[PDB]
Ligand SMILES: CN1CCN([C@H]2CC[C@@H](n3cc(-c4ccc(Oc5ccccc5)cc4)c4c(N)ncnc43)CC2)CC1
């Protein structure tokens with residue numbers, strides 16, 4: 001007897017899945033991953049539901065101010081997302097203190113600007129300061145909603161949260177082409193094209209159509225079966241695959257296209273430096289994930305980075321850059337074809353420059369052999385006007401001749417995330 005409750009409204013779009021509004025309770029019958037067989041207590045109908053749309057009754061996840069499986073940087077990003085205001089807060093799983101919680105509050109500083117402060121929450125009973133004890137988390141928030149214990153700003157409304165992406169159809173990895181309606185061509189290339197399409201007249205998706213050639217079918221599909229496992233918030237979601245030549249790659253749809261185009265647009269020109277640093281931090285996070293898995297990207301640049309409607313950067317074309325440009329390529333890969341994760345680090349340096357210059361072409365005014373001869377002399381791109389010295393230093397560290405002396409994506413991610421934050425200022429220390 002395991003009962004769950006719905007966190008968001010949901011409309012059925014498949015054959016045997018249920019519709020439920022926010023508040024409806026339900027009985028779990030089968031735990032089959034992303035989809036769960038369940039019986040509604042409101043309609044008495046049995047059918048499948050998305051796992052991430054419900055939570056066990058009176059678990060912390062049912063609360064509006066609680067967020068599960070979310071990092072400190074993600075907490076900062078979500079709290080700083082538009083709509084929220086001064087005092088916006090959340091309670092989350094502590095990244096460093098396992099089994100414990102943390103409070104993240106939106107504050108304003110006359111120096112930096114809009115910021116997010118974090119506080120550790122102690123066990124045995126909960127408290128931030130040893131003076132004010134609280135029986136539950138709910139009392140803990142209820143106290144600070146009017147009048148703080150001496151922390152930045154007082155608590156207000158919980159952090160705003162949108163509906164999660166509805167997971168892909170239950171067991172629909174290899175789909176027939178008939179399910180797709182490639183409605184509008186987004187872009188074309190030497191190896192194929194990209195379309196905005198719909199899946200079964202309800203699910204907006206993107207499709208990379210590959211022209212038949214060097215791309216060996218079985219080998220490619222093996223590589224794609226590898227790609228499916230590499231799921232991460234900073235990697236574009238790979239939904240389905242049409243196995244019959246010509247091969248179609250069905251993925252999540254990114255509303256604002258590539259990072260290059262977005263940067264070159266007006267809204268992209270409206271984006272201040274901290275935001276650009278945030279973009280690069282998200283990219284570095286994705287590459288850190290790829291590094292942890294030991295796989296290699298082989299073609300990192302703003303054109304192969306996609307942007308969501310909510311300005312979330314995701315990596316695309318990962319691994320695909322093998323199964324089938326030197327200005328983004330490390331010297332060792334240019335000369336001896338030795339593509340490693342360090343060459344990807346070099347590429348990340350170039351992409352960093354590309355970001356800070358709002359999509360400008362690297363080495364402006366130079367041809368490919370021009371650049372090649374330049375690199376031998378030990379030449380690097382100069383620091384742009386708007387680029388911070390400390391970020392340029394990161395770029396330069398990415399562009400070291402020896403790939404061995406190049407930083408990992410783990411380090412780069414850590415540095416970029418806390419770029420404006422002194423280590424001692426991550427979590428506030430209250431008396
Ligand atoms: C000129 N080019 C660079 C790319 N690009 C544009 C990049 C911007 C745009 N675009 C690419 C895609 C795209 C879709 C599938 C795709 O396939 C993958 C394969 C392996 C791993 C991940 C994705 C890669 C990119 C895309 C998307 N999913 N959502 C929204 N916009 C997208 C297509 C127009 C075009 C050919």
Ligand SMILES: [Ca+2]
Nearest residue numbers: 424427428429
């Ligand atoms: Ca501190």
Ligand SMILES: [Cl-]
Nearest residue numbers: 027039040041
């Ligand atoms: Cl029942």
